[PDB]
Amino acid sequence: MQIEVTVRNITPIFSAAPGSNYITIDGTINPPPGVSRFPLVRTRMMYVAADVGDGVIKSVPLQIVPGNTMRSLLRRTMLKHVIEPALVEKGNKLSIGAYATAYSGNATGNPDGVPSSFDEIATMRAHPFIGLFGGGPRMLEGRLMVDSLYPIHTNAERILGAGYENEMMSGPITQVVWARRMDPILNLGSSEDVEVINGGAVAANGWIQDLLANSKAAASKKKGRGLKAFNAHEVVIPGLKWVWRISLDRPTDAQVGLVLLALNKMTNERIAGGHSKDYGRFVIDGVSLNGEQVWSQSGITGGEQYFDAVAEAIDGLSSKEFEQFAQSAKE
């Protein structure tokens, strides 16, 4: 269906980048050693070939959410809002391996290389959810194909062909956000504040003496880990316009209807991470279906054939297909 969805993040995006990154107090990423450095958890970056100047084509970092990530997010929204509600209003139920297959693709690791039957492959790829997420122990090819979240940015001009030259950002696109993590009993000030702690003042002062002894240990090591940890993490700035390309190689109308009903549940969902700091909230401001704009503020108001197809396929949903999907041939 070549679904293109533009979602405006109204809070920062923090899909953390694995690595060991540092930052000085000023804000220089990965400083030369010897200066006082604090750990920085950067957002997810991809290098992208982009037009800087004119024909000077270069790999610049563009800050994204991974396609694996938002793919998992797409699965969880449909699973949380369409599949399992329609699976528990009836008496159907899922084994723990089949829940693990419906969520993680596979019930376990160590997959069986014994393949699966042709009637089976056809019936799972005709399924509303399993044909989208073809996991299982015998590894299906799911027909749902999910893009990384791209900011509509001048560095993503080669990714996004035309129609996105307006509402398109440029320049630096991130912000380093710091966190303190203050030890709580240092904030303790009176006998009224300390009455809930067992022993009151004696236990509080004992942890104080532990903290100062650990401070002498740290000063001895420089020249057991406390609760003061002041660090940084880099987020993508809020209010950016992003594009998301869902792709479906010859879908059943119920399957793209499942994508569209998931998109309906896309609101009040979190994109990337930073769940304590409300990062990853967003609003969809566009959905296009074969390039046709099918998003109003109320909802989809379109794609009706896919909607009734996924409706008919979710009263027809049951746990037998999920269980025979999760069943391992060796086990």
């Binding site: 393949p115 039957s117 042709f118 009637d119 790829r125 010859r250």
Partner: protein, 219 residues
């Protein structure tokens, strides 16, 4: 005219498992030139000896072309190429339910059969290739100008020739004998590198039906 061919190639080629005679290459170029001339439906055995190359005759028949096998001067380290043949199991399931496909069996087998995923690693060299031969020049020029690539499995794009140069050299300066010839071949031409093997001396060097005892070098 007693000339050496060197050929420099753009993409790396597949490292030849057995010594490849230059004569075999130019026989294929004559075959493709005939396919351009006399159409597709032609027997390749009529033109694959029609070469601008002279003929050395062994004492009991067993004529070979005056060419040599290509010697490799490596510009790059050797590597190994993986390729797989896997039939698309998913597409076959869709075609089986649709009825376009007519296979009674419902289960594929990656070990063997139609849906055998198969993985094979072939050696890869990027080099400069040198061959000695005894032969006129301009026919070899026209043939190697028609020649686009060198190496095996060209349908996946390997070993395209960036350029070639073909030039005369002295009579003692070129051992063209670095080549698979009948064992009954004269001693002058057999060196210490040549050894007895079940080798092809002519034409199709893969035709195992025509294979016979021969003195051949190793690539």
């Amino acid at each position: 005219v007693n000339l050496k061919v060197t050929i420099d190639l753009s993409n790396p080629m597949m490292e030849p498992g057995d010594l490849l005679h230059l004569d075999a290459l130019l026989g294929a170029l004559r075959v493709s030139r005939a396919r351009a001339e006399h159409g597709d439906a032609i027997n390749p055995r009529d033109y694959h000896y029609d070469l601008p190359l002279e003929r050395y005759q062994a004492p009991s028949g067993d004529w070979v072309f005056k060419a040599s096998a290509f010697k490799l001067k490596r510009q790059l380290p050797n590597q190994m190429w993986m390729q797989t043949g896997r039939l698309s199991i998913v597409e076959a399931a869709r075609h089986r339910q649709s009825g376009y496909l007519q296979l009674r069996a419902g289960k594929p087998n990656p070990a063997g059969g139609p849906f055998k995923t198969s993985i094979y690693h072939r050696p890869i060299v990027q080099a400069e290739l040198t061959a000695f031969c005894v032969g006129d020049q301009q026919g070899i020029e026209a043939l190697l100008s028609e020649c686009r690539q060198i190496g095996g499995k060209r349908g996946v794009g390997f070993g395209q020739v960036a350029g070639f140069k073909v030039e005369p050299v002295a009579e003692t300066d070129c051992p063209w004998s670095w080549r698979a010839l009948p064992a009954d071949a004269d001693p002058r031409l057999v060196t210490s590198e040549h050894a007895r093997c079940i080798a092809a001396i002519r034409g199709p060097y893969w035709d195992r039906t025509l294979h016979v005892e021969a003195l051949a070098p190793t690539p």
